[model samples]
Target chain A: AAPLVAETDANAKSLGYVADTTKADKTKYPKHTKDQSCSTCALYQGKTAPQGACPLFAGKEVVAKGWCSAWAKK
Target chain B: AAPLVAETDANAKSLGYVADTTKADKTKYPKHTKDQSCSTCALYQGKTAPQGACPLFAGKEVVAKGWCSAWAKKA
Candidate 1:
């Protein structure tokens, strides 16, 4: 599994994955909030580490604080 | 500008552009609904045609009823 997810990855691009939630385009995603991050997403599947895996990303790890459009409430 | 957007285009891929709004991945973008489309998006630059240009796509036109990750709302 890759430790980091590339923004250029097709899955990453489609999912609008951002390594940092702050970089998530607010204009493109008006629903985004400062609190939305991998850690806060219901689908996040790793321990409370600085980075972890997301089923959506397959083999790559997402910044625990990163964000993607798939973000959902737990 | 191109008559239609290419899903393989960097801009299109990055923005998750699709020719039809109905094909938009619901799981990947859980916020999306059936009603969202370029025609309903405030940023739509094309008239009430089947396809039109979008400022975001620069040199390409998007389907009037296409969907993208960047879709926005209007009254």
Candidate 2:
């Protein structure tokens, strides 16, 4: 059997698959944080941490420090 | 060359595509209430009204009256 098809990079971006957290508050919201991150929060829908869409925050990916009022302990 | 592949009903059920809203508080939470529904709440993630998962209440669907503390009006 042949390899399965994968989306092109251009197509991925159009489909909201590309992750960009460039301008995030890294000092206050580092890529890795002990206290924050979507995975630790109660509202994260993905099976893993920091890798899913938040209910209150969408399209805009969630980092640990990327807080909103909806934050709840997992 | 053929019709698009549609998921079978049985397959769709296995894929977490079924919508069940039983045991919900209807007297206090009507399905068509003017107030409650996932689409009206700030944390609702679906594209339309009353048809999505809530951030606070996962798996459990939202009615307008199905409230928590995170309600915020759309700007």
Candidate 3:
């Protein structure tokens, strides 16, 4: 699938969206443990894949390891 | 500072807010990366603390590693 949520996008920036959880700033997101990711979220279409569709970004696939403010449990 | 923004709170659910970004669901938040958290967010008041005040939570302290839908970059 094609990728959509660009980190620089207005909405992406607003939600603190990132494609790789490892890249998240530890100082800023200190509570962000390493386990949280897109693959484990409820909005992910591809449960086991590294990337999948998300309602947050229509017509776009996000990385499984990505993190954002909109994250939800599945 | 007092801790606020419970994960079970109504507002917290809507924002998909989690005290620990690591506990965030991957399938629902397919775009959730480990690099983001309250501490790194622009709304964070305690840049270096494990918990800090966030405007989204009405100035209440949230986990430094928490994840929410209102996260913004530090400018």
Candidate closest to the true structure, highest DockQ: 2
Candidate that beats the other on lDDT, 1 or 2, i.e. the better one: 1
What would the TM-scores of all predictions be?
A: 0.49, 0.26, 0.47
Candidate 3 lDDT over residue span B1-75, tens digit each: 864668875446767889998987778888878787887788888779888776555425689989987778777
Among all windows of 10 consecutive residues in model 3 chain B, the one with the lowest summed lDDT is: B52-61
RMSD (CA, angstroms), candidate 2: 14.8
Scored against the true structure, residue A42 in model 2 reaches a CA lDDT of 84
Given candidate 2, what's the lDDT at residue B64? 33
Task: Summarize candidate 2's per-residue lDDT along B1-75 as a digit string, tens digits.
Answer: 112112222222222221222323346434433353335656656556544455533234444333333445566
Model 1 RMSD in angstroms: 14.1
Best prediction by lDDT:
1
**Which parts of model 3 have CA positions greater than 4 angstroms off?**
A1-74
lDDT of 2: 0.39
lDDT of each: 0.79, 0.39, 0.73
User: Which ranges in model 2 have alpha carbons more than 4 Å from their true place?
Assistant: A1-33, A63-69, B1-75
Query: Which portions of model 1 show Cα errors greater than 4 Å?
Result: A1-74
Over the true interface, candidate 1 deviates by an RMSD, in Å, of 12.5
Tell me the tens digit of each residue's lDDT in model 2 across A1-74: 11111223343333322133232244543343345544556876655544444544332234433343334678
What pairs collide in candidate 2? A36-A64, A37-A64, A39-A49, A39-A50, B36-B63, B36-B64, B36-B65, B37-B63, B37-B64
lDDT of 1 at B13: 67
Candidate 1, A32: how far from true, in Å? 43
